[PDB]
């Protein structure tokens, strides 16, 4: 029956999920009448903005929304943090490699956004999330040993019971380290990465065949097709689906993502060298022919970015597309680079000499943004969220220590200029000898730092000398300071000790502690990065960004006439036939009980 | 018996002397087995090369921008590389008070094209004896570049090799 | 071309090369010389653990612990 469950959500104990739902109902057990969609909204907020809703109101046991009673008690027991009542709920589920990973992601997000109470949300929720990660790894490593070829079918299907999302996206969205260190997921990712070409080709052979095209045709590269039809047909027959033909192999080789990565990175280095020669050697009053290629290149690059915005996902909503598109970080770097280039192109044909210089400065800053967009590929990760968690804390702690040091150096500067100089009527020398010189002093070497005598470069006989001379210290006798030099040295020793050692050692302690924690964190960072590369270099068309508009013409003409690429992603996400689905789920339920 | 090769042979003997003097140290330090060396030499050299590539990108960026903003187009290619890849590369190892070497006109000569005896072209001047670009922006940009290059990457290099 | 026929060293080699913790311990007491057999098994396990490459749940833990 319906609504027996609605009352079951009504009777939930005081929790952070209950506080969120109570905040939602504005716009204790047994009083309310909670509708299911009001739950379903917050469940989407915890699960991710990508997925479809779980509960359509008054459409129960009838936009897929299948009615599974196994996944209701498990979700109800997970969202209130019950260690021993979700373990009872888990064996009643239908598919248990998607359920455990969805529970792990919900628990880690709900443990993150708690804030106030950290006796519960740290220990209980992170330990329960690691528990369900370990359960999912155990079930999948039991399934992978028995068949090893159905497991890869199991990781890529669509489960309708968890918002039409695949298991692999739930696995890698929540940063599950031990599920991706497993061998089967890496074999599946390498099988995607290598594309049409068969594995075990060494690294140099791919680039050497990318240089010389008929070398691939000479049998130098093993392919998928030939090896598969050679082993499969023969092994089955001897113990007891078309042959690749004349001109198909060229498009089959050019459709691979691994080759496309190299043919994009080489064009990007060519772009950097072209911009480097244009910015320095010839930047004429009029735009020279060499500088036109730059503009044609950008036009192709902007059209490429517009196509990524269009057909990375199939959400069909303009808020739905742009809201996930701006949630990237590499796209942010690209958006800022293109905006700076457009502002430079506006300023660059001003025909007034005042703005001609400013435009060149803008292009130099745009070059810095492009050269950092290089390093973003090989080092940084895609996700916007986890960066802020450490950037904010470490920048805040750095700023507080830096403020603490700035106070001390201002104190030393104001006193040191206070004691030995007559009142100075010029304000620039005040700041230049009170904040600048003690700031530059503390980085200097201790024998070099002693630069103290009465009269070398200071001139003070008639007011102040204008050509870059500070006022002299006051003299009592001829060629002597009234203030002893050894007090200046003693005071410099105290200031030098306290500034040089005690604060900077604390700065080096914090930054080094993060650096050692970051470097000693894991060995699975590179493996995680591979998957970040795979998507963008998978979807992108084969031909390099000089000739990407040639691909845009075909793909734009095809887009409005008859629907092209009906499976937008056909090696990641698949919709299994209904007769196969039941036999697939029964096998993994058997393996779960056997586990 | 031809003077062209007499020098090259002496260079070859010097390299052979270096190989003999390393054959000394092989006895007392290194081990015999060929196999276990590659297991760590390959990984550490590969990680070193990747970090070094990551630093080289940054120093090329800083050099091309810094020479981009304050100099008129230079028709000589050797000064381009000599003041765009060489000087920012030598800068990051220098001490921070010594690293500030910035003023308009000491050794640059630019009045008639370029001076041939080892003089770079001058920065552009608006007034007499002034850079149109402020010196404190150059210092501010040098501080940002110096911080990011001096600390964050090299500490990662020292972290791996020391580990 | 010596090739002596020893039945003790056949079950031990057959049980070592498939990584059986509890069936090579039965096979070891049937051997004739047991200071050469254990060291040969240790070398075979360490080389076979090195050149695996793909799977490192088995080849690290099981093989290096059995070799030690
Ligand atoms: Ca993009």
């Amino acid at each position: 029956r319906e609504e027996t469950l609605c009352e079951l959500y009504s009777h939930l104990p005081s929790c952070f999920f209950l506080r969120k739902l109570a905040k939602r109902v504005q716009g204790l057990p047994g009083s309310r009448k909670v509708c299911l969609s009001h739950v379903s909204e917050e469940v989407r907020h915890l699960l991710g903005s990508f997925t479809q809703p779980l509960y359509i109101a008054s459409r129960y046991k009838p936009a897929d929304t299948v009615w599974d009673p196994g996944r209701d008690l498990f979700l109800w027991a997970v969202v209130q943090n019950n260690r021993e009542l979700a373990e009872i709920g888990w064996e009643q589920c239908r598919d248990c490699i998607a359920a455990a990973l969805a529970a792990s992601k919900i628990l880690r997000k709900l443990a993150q956004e708690s804030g106030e109470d950290d006796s519960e949300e740290a220990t209980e929720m992170l330990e329960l999330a690691n528990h369900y990660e370990k359960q999912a790894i155990g079930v999948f490593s039991e399934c992978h040993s028995w068949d090893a070829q159905r497991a890869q079918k199991l990781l890529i299907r669509i489960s309708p019971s968890w918002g039409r999302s695949t298991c692999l996206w739930l696995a890698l969205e929540a940063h599950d380290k031990s599920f991706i260190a497993h061998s089967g997921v890496q074999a599946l990712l390498t099988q995607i990465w290598c594309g049409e070409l068969s594995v075990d080709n060494p690294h140099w052979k791919v680039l050497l065949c990318m240089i010389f095209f008929p070398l691939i045709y000479t049998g130098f590269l093993t392919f998928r097709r030939d090896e598969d039809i050679q082993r499969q047909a023969e092994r089955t027959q001897q113990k007891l689906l078309k042959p690749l033909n004349c001109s198909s192999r060229l498009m089959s080789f050019l459709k691979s993502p691994q080759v496309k990565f190299y043919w994009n990175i080489a064009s990007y280095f060519g772009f950097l060298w072209l911009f480097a020669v244009v910015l320095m050697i010839d930047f004429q009053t009029s735009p020279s022919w060499r500088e036109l290629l730059l503009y044609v290149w950008l036009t192709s690059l902007v059209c490429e970015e517009i196509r990524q915005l269009y057909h990375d996902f199939d959400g069909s909503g303009f808020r739905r597309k742009a809201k996930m598109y701006i949630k990237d970080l590499w796209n942010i770097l690209d958006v800022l680079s293109i905006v700076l280039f457009i502002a430079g192109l506006i300023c660059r044909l001003q025909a007034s000499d005042t703005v001609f210089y400013i435009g060149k400065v803008i292009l130099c800053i745009d070059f810095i943004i492009f050269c950092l967009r290089l390093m973003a590929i090989f080092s940084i990760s895609r996700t916007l969220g986890p960066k802020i968690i450490i950037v904010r804390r470490m920048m805040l702690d750095l700023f507080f220590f830096m403020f603490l040091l700035s106070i001390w150096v201002v104190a030393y500067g104001v006193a040191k200029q206070g004691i030995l100089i007559e009142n100075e009527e010029r304000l620039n020398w005040i700041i230049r000898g009170a904040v600048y010189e003690p700031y530059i002093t503390i980085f200097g070497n201790f024998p070099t730092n002693i630069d103290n005598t009465l009269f070398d470069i200071s001139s003070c006989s008639v007011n102040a000398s204008d050509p870059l001379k500070p006022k002299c210290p006051m003299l009592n006798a001829d060629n002597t300071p009234v203030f002893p030099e050894w007090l200046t040295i003693m005071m410099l020793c105290v200031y030098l000790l306290f500034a040089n050692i005690l604060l900077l050692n604390l700065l080096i302690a914090i930054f080094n502690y993060t650096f050692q924690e970051v470097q000693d964190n894991t060995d699975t960072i590179w493996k995680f990065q591979r998957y970040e590369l795979i998507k963008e270099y998978h979807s992108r068309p084969a031909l390099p960004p000089p000739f990407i508009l040639l691909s845009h013409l075909i793909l734009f003409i095809r887009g409005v006439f008859l629907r092209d690429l009906p499976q937008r992603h056909k090696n990641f996400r698949q919709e299994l036939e209904q007769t196969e689905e039941e036999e697939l789920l029964s096998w993994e339920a058997y393996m779960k009980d056997n586990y």
Side-chain angles (χ1 to χ4, degrees), chain A residues 1-2 4-6 8-24 27 29-30 34-40 43-55 57-58 60 62-63 65-83 85-86 88-115 119 122-123 125-126 128-146 148-172 174-195 197 199 201-204 214 217 219-225 229 233 243 249 253 257-283 287 289-290 292-298 301-302 304-311 315 317 321-322 324-326 329-351 355-365 367-421 423 427-431 433-436 438-448 450-455 460 464 467 470-474 477 481 483-484 486-489 491-500 502-509 512-514 516-517 520 526-531 533-547 550 552 559 566 569 572-576 578-581 583-595:
Chain A
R1 293 179 68 85
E2 202 268 333
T4 63
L5 177 63
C6 291
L8 186 61
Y9 277 108
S10 179
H11 279 92
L12 204 144
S14 66
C15 291
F16 184 72
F17 181 77
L18 183 61
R19 288 195 292 268
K20 291 181 71 67
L21 197 147
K23 190 180 92 274
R24 185 175 293 274
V34 175
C35 295
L36 294 176
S37 66
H38 299 166
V39 175
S40 174
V43 177
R44 284 180 58 188
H45 181 74
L46 283 174
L47 188 61
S49 68
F50 176 73
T51 184
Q52 293 187 1
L54 277 76
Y55 294 102
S58 297
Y60 192 101
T65 68
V66 294
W67 151 80
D68 196 2
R71 70 178 177 89
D72 291 328
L73 295 178
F74 182 69
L75 182 62
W76 178 72
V78 164
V79 299
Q80 67 184 92
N81 191 334
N82 219 318
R83 185 180 246 276
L85 188 147
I88 297 169
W90 184 57
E91 296 98 8
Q92 300 293 322
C93 291
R94 184 63 175 165
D95 48 351
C96 295
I97 306 100
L101 298 176
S104 178
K105 186 171 176 63
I106 289 174
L107 288 172
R108 286 179 180 174
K109 181 68 176 176
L110 191 67
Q112 179 178 0
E113 68 177 3
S114 69
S119 179
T123 62
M125 289 182 182
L126 291 175
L128 191 63
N130 290 318
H131 180 73
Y132 284 110
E133 179 178 359
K134 184 173 71 68
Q135 293 296 109
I137 295 163
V139 174
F140 181 73
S141 67
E142 182 67 27
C143 292
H144 182 269
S145 68
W146 203 258
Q149 194 62 253
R150 289 184 179 178
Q152 295 181 0
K153 184 65 68 68
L154 186 62
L155 288 176
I156 64 171
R157 67 179 177 89
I158 295 170
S159 64
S161 297
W162 291 96
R164 304 290 292 165
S165 181
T166 184
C167 181
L168 192 66
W169 183 71
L170 270 302
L172 285 94
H175 295 286
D176 288 331
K177 326 267 182 220
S178 178
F179 189 78
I180 309 303
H182 191 270
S183 177
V185 182
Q186 294 295 320
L188 177 63
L189 287 176
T190 302
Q191 182 174 0
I192 295 168
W193 174 257
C194 196
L197 273 75
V199 296
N201 288 319
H203 293 284
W204 60 82
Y217 293 162
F220 185 67
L221 297 179
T222 60
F223 286 182
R224 171 70 61 84
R225 185 68 63 86
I229 203 161
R249 301 174 76 90
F253 182 78
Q258 186 183 7
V259 179
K260 195 185 294 186
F261 176 69
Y262 298 112
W263 266 98
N264 266 337
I265 200 68
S267 64
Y268 196 80
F269 282 110
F271 178 70
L272 288 175
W273 185 61
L274 192 276
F275 196 84
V277 66
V278 165
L279 185 62
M280 293 187 286
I281 289 175
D282 49 354
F283 186 77
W289 56 279
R290 267 182 183 174
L292 295 176
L293 277 72
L294 187 62
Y295 301 159
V296 177
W297 207 283
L298 260 281
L301 185 60
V302 172
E304 173 66 26
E305 289 292 327
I306 292 171
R307 202 273 312 160
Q308 211 181 311
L309 189 143
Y310 279 166
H311 283 170
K321 291 191 176 71
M324 69 175 71
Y325 186 78
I326 303 300
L329 189 145
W330 299 355
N331 288 319
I332 289 177
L333 285 178
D334 290 345
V335 163
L336 290 178
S337 67
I338 292 170
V339 167
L340 290 175
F341 187 82
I342 290 169
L345 258 286
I346 291 169
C347 294
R348 188 227 181 274
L349 280 80
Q350 187 59 256
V355 192
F356 182 75
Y357 185 72
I358 305 299
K360 196 177 193 295
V361 175
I362 293 167
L363 266 69
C364 293
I365 303 302
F367 177 72
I368 296 172
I369 301 297
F370 264 92
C371 279
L372 198 144
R373 182 65 183 89
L374 198 290
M375 296 187 287
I377 293 174
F378 293 102
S379 177
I380 211 66
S381 177
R382 185 182 293 273
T383 63
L384 182 63
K387 270 74 175 175
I388 302 297
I389 306 298
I390 308 299
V391 164
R392 179 175 286 173
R393 286 174 69 252
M394 299 301 171
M395 185 267 288
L396 188 64
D397 189 75
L398 182 67
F399 164 96
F400 161 80
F401 262 99
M402 189 66 72
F403 164 78
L404 188 67
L405 191 144
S406 67
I407 303 301
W408 180 253
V409 300
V410 169
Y412 172 70
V414 172
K416 175 64 182 295
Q417 192 169 1
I419 283 159
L420 58 92
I421 294 169
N423 57 98
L427 188 143
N428 53 0
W429 288 105
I430 293 296
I431 182 169
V435 182
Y436 181 72
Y439 232 143
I440 202 66
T441 302
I442 61 171
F443 285 153
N445 192 31
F446 186 76
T448 65
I450 302 171
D451 293 331
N452 283 315
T453 190
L454 188 283
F455 193 84
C460 66
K471 189 178 286 293
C472 71
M474 72 182 78
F483 193 73
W486 60 275
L487 272 305
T488 299
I489 301 169
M491 188 182 293
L492 188 146
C493 286
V494 175
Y495 167 69
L496 260 293
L497 180 62
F498 284 166
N500 194 3
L502 276 72
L503 282 80
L504 295 176
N505 258 337
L506 265 294
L507 272 302
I508 294 168
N512 179 225
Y513 152 77
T514 59
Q516 189 268 330
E517 292 295 330
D520 202 75
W526 169 240
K527 324 169 156 270
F528 280 162
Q529 191 71 35
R530 300 187 75 238
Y531 183 75
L533 295 172
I534 294 169
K535 288 180 179 291
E536 205 177 3
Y537 282 139
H538 165 75
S539 173
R540 179 170 286 173
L543 204 58
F547 303 101
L550 177 63
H552 286 296
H569 300 285
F572 291 162
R573 180 167 294 176
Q574 190 179 359
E575 181 71 28
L576 265 296
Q578 193 269 332
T579 181
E580 177 63 30
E581 185 70 26
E583 182 174 0
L584 190 58
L585 289 177
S586 300
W587 172 61
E588 58 93 19
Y590 182 81
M591 299 304 286
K592 178 178 75 176
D593 293 332
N594 218 31
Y595 173 70

